[PDB]
């Protein structure tokens, strides 16, 4: 069962890859939120102190 066997395990390995794909891509995306937030959170201070 050489061919189809290893092909199926490569299939499943691919699947594992895509779950990794998500976790990483949207972990970056979610970090973007507070990445933004801190900016304006300093910014209103930056505007009004002067």
């Amino acid at each position: 069962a050489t061919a189809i066997e290893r092909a199926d395990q490569l299939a499943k390995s691919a699947v594992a890859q895509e779950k990794a794909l998500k976790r990483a891509e949207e972990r970056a995306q979610q970090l973007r939120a507070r990445l933004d937030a801190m900016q304006e959170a300093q910014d209103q201070v930056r505007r009004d102190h002067e």
Binding site: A16, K19, A20, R23
Partner: peptide
């Protein structure tokens, strides 16, 4: 000073917690 390291130590968790799942996948 004591302020300084705390971030890294706390971030260590956030750093460390990463190792938890991706290994667990396999």
């Amino acid at each position: 000073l004591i302020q300084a390291e705390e971030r890294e130590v706390s971030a260590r968790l956030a750093a460390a917690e990463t190792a938890l799942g991706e290994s667990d996948a396999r």
